[PDB]
Paper text:
In P. aeruginosa, two soluble lectins, LecA and LecB were initially identified and characterized. Besides their proposed primary function as adhesins, lectins also participate in biofilm formation and exhibit cytotoxic effects.
Additionally, we successfully co‐crystallized the LecA‐14 and LecB‐14 complexes to characterize the structural interactions between bispecific α,β‐thiodisaccharides and lectins. The structure of the LecB‐14 complex was resolved at 1.85 Å in the P212121 space group, with 8 protomers in the ASU. The β‐d‐galactose is situated within a binding groove, anchored by a water bridge connecting its O4 and O5 oxygens to Asp96, and engaged in interaction with the C6 carbon and a hydrophobic patch formed by Val69 and Gly24. In the case of LecA, KD of all ligands was in the submillimolar range, whereas, for LecB, KD of bispecific inhibitors reached the submicromolar range. Due to the lack of an extensive linker in compound 14, both lectins have insufficient space to simultaneously bind a single molecule of compound 14. This finding supports the earlier discussion on the inability of bispecific inhibitors to bind LecA and LecB simultaneously.
Numbering used by the authors:
A (entry chain B), B (entry chain A), C (entry chain C), D (entry chain D): 1 to 114
The structure:
């Protein structure tokens, strides 16, 4: 099944944050309506934040997270969770190797903001 | 129902990151085994990371998130989500006022790390 | 925080299924746009399905689950989870006593159907 | 990533319920410790509950959901969510064709019971 794709409400501000837990450098791309809206790159084995940004979901609401290490696409796992019918999290895990911890890059998208 | 309390696997490192979306200064307290392990404070209406730390769940695995604004306990909502039977997120939202956006402080706990 | 309230897409069919795990008879009311759309009652300590129905979300898409036992409203816990940006689950547990298993009635809403 | 596989606490009762939303006959198999513990089959475009059962997770606690149509394995999606640190749902969707609604068989596992 496709993973790392989420339909947000249109024209909404949202936060995107990425963490790294790998000896490899993680590159995280966030596409909005199929155009790169944020790119984070960094390396950590201690859950360091490698980037955070505020974005707007635009007219489509379509947000996609992609992860690669040295040009190789990581395998993704994802889900969206809504608390009290208001607070939204779109969560992404990624695996760059063999151990299947799926934490190599971790991406959290939250809305609403403000 | 109790919110913002999670049983993690014992003796496990976990990430805890807090975001602010409110006029009010948010104070996030993270307890492990009922003892304060981290305190974040900050103010933003643009989802600024007001703190991020790596902690250990210790022998109990009992982790609790509290949020207060100027001393007043915020109302919490929470859940845990597990992807591919491996990647864990504990999520907390909090409301300091009347608008019920539940984003005033947002706390994300993730494990495993490394 | 309010629990047991979910905003579905408007004019969309959804499944609702209730399960009981208590010595007391459980009454589950499902409201659509603030009007009773279905009512289920049953007693089980073995997770028996005490009711199932297909309903329409109507123009608001607002769906509310209420649970009571012998007249007394149960304490509710809820969340919505979306998998592969497509498959929606609205989940409710409820507590009628002191043991805090929150399974005394369990209500599962799923969409889309067909 | 592996989908439809869940680690439960050992020797615990859980409910499993399957729903169908397809013109094809769905076969849902539930494995405990890699052995078939329940089987449900049926065809519905209206969210019929094609089966519900109470099982015991056994000594491993490993539970797996498999779905097929006419012997062809369906693509699965899954997650686990925990409410008030107590109430557990393991959720599975499955796709038998090309439209990617992932609702063709839906399976929900809940614990604890009683
Ligand atoms: C620490 C370790 O990092 C990787 S495994 C690691 O990946 C790099 C990528 O550049 C090299 O291929 C090494 O040969 C590999 O050992 C993570 O997948 C793993 O979970 C762990 O965090
Ligand atoms: C921007 C706004 O912030 C608060 S409402 C705000 O709360 C502060 C708390 O110190 C004072 O009560 C102000 O008088 C209030 O208006 C959030 O609850 C709200 O969601 C929004 O982010
Ligand atoms: C078996 C038991 O059922 C209840 S406790 C039970 O509640 C009924 C009403 O539902 C009466 O108040 C009795 O006096 C109580 O003992 C559940 O709360 C519990 O989890 C367990 O399933
Ligand atoms: C109603 C429809 O059913 C299938 S698509 C459907 O699958 C059967 C399987 O036996 C045949 O291949 C038909 O030729 C196909 O049209 C679902 O995938 C779809 O979501 C929808 O529920
Ligand atoms: Ca890895
Ligand atoms: Ca890793
Ligand atoms: Ca607020
Ligand atoms: Ca706010
Ligand atoms: Ca109870
Ligand atoms: Ca009970
Ligand atoms: Ca389908
Ligand atoms: Ca279908």
């Amino acid at each position: 099944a496709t993973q790392g794709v989420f339909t947000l409400p249109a024209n909404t501000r949202f936060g995107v944050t990425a963490f790294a837990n790998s000896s490899g450098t993680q590159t995280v791309n966030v596409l909005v309506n199929n155009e790169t809206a944020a790119t984070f790159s960094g390396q950590s084995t201690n859950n360091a934040v490698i980037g955070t940004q505020v974005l707007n979901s635009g007219s489509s609401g379509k947000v996609q997270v992609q992860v690669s290490v040295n040009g190789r696409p990581s395998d993704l796992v994802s889900a969206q969770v809504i608390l009290t019918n208001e607070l939204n999290f779109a969560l992404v895990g990624s695996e760059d190797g063999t151990d299947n911890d799926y934490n190599d890059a971790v991406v959290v998208i939250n809305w609403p903001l403000g």
